Amino acid sequence: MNQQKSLTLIVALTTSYGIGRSNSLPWKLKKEISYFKRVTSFVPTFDSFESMNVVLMGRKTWESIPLQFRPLKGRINVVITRNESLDLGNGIHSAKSLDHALELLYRTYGSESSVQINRIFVIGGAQLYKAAMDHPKLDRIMATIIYKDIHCDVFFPLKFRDKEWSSVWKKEKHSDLESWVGTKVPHGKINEDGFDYEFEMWTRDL
Numbered sequence: 001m002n003q004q005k006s007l008t009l010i011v012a013l014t015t016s017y018g019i020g021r022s023n024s025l026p027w028k029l030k031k032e033i034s035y036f037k038r039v040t041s042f043v044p045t046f047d048s049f050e051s052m053n054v055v056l057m058g059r060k061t062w063e064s065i066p067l068q069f070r071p072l073k074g075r076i077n078v079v080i081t082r083n084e085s086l087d088l089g090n091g092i093h094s095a096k097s098l099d100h101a102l103e104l105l106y107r108t109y110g111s112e113s114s115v116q117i118n119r120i121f122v123i124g125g126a127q128l129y130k131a132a133m134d135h136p137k138l139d140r141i142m143a144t145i146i147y148k149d150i151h152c153d154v155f156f157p158l159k160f161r162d163k164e165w166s167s168v169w170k171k172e173k174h175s176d177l178e179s180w181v182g183t184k185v186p187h188g189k190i191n192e193d194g195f196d197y198e199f200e201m202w203t204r205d206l
Ligand SMILES: COc1ccc(OCCc2ccccc2)cc1Cc1cnc2nc(N)nc(N)c2c1C
Pocket: 010, 011, 012, 024, 025, 030, 032, 033, 034, 036, 037, 061, 064, 065, 066, 069, 122, 123, 124, 143, 144
């Protein structure tokens, strides 16, 4: 045991693979954020007495999130940092890598435990995205594609939507996206604050 479950990466990015600027996101999309909350939060139903999803994130993403929203509620938060800091505080959870995080989670949230783990999401940092992309259990990318090359200075590390990666990563039908996420999701382009964007789900075989 340690690799029972696959990982899912969730990310909002520009057609240039832009994901961030200054330790923020150079867009403010309140319906996007709300999709993120619903996806990372949703647990199939018979399960939802025991079950919680996990969000894994890098230190600077943790720092990036406005203090009033940390830890992300109704999810198990784990911050991944090669320098066991710290910063705690409210109950929460550090590991020096993706695999140390998974080991900590499996130790902490066992069959015995009152809380059980449902799905595990990597929610960013560029650096943790790169670790997740290299991990043999990552098989799923929930991507919000922002159709505007907004200036960014932090980039998603692998062009998964590009021709070079297209025998590995496949974009799924929208009905399958709605299935996975268990609700209606808007199809096609959405316009908030002068940006068109759309939700995609991509997968690869393990
Ligand atoms: C600065 O990154 C923020 C900033 C604020 C924020 O607010 C959550 C609380 C809230 C609730 C209700 C309204 C407003 C705020 C969450 C994030 C992380 C985020 C956002 N979209 C995200 N979207 C995608 N596609 N992927 C992510 N990984 C992601 C991630 C990590």
